[PDB]
Amino acid sequence: MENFQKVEKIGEGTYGVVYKARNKLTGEVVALKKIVPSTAIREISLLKELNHPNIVKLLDVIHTENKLYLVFEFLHQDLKKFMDASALTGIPLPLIKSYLFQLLQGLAFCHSHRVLHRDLKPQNLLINTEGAIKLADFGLARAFTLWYRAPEILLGCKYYSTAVDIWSLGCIFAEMVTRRALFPGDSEIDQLFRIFRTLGTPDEVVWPGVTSMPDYKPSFPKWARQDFSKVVPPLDEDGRSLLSQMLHYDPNKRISAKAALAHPFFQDVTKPVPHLRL
């Protein structure tokens, strides 16, 4: 750690604290996260090879006085803050589209290597002045806010799939569009009931096997599904059709990232430049 010079505290992943920092030798400005089991060391090392333009570059992993430091490339803003800054006007649709598309490319990549994110959230989607958006916190959940949690996780499935990331990203896509989080649950049961209230209480018809899940209860209230035209209103038919497929209850019916990149919604995808200020 002697090689780094802390500049400012950037946030707290509650994994540890994150600092904006400068590399004394390189001159590089990076994000240092202060986090050690051998298993964690080996899984972290494999994250060092999972390089993609839409994944925050893990630069180095330092382990000393048995404390763990992750050195990432630094990005100047995150999607939570950009959404909050774009709240009066809303992010332009072409920019929503480009961000969704790039995150899907990032997810198609990790998922093809069998790596899952497990905790997507606007705060860990980082953006730069060039129009790029990147997945961050990536792979660390296997290694070491419920609003984006997929329902199979909340119902207690132990062996959930890459579909949990598609669910999370659909919720983020809806929030970009409406400027309000989709399912702002403040407890696990509140999160599940907010989902049920919008998409209908799941049953064996739409989700085979749902009733045998560990935390599934036959006493759950039975709500009717609503339509997506009422849930993400401004969005066109292509976008709403894609969102409904990213939000299918059954994890096996939910669209994959790779198939989502082929959806008609991306026919006119472009890469606009965002208006940022730091």
Ligand SMILES: COc1ccc(CC(=O)Nc2cn([C@H]3C[C@@H](NC(C)=O)C3)cn2)cc1
């Ligand atoms: C004015 O202060 C700020 C505040 C926030 C930000 C954006 C940001 O968070 N950038 C960032 C994080 N990382 C790594 C992602 C790693 N975080 C975790 C928890 O994995 C740090 C790289 N670039 C920029 C400046």
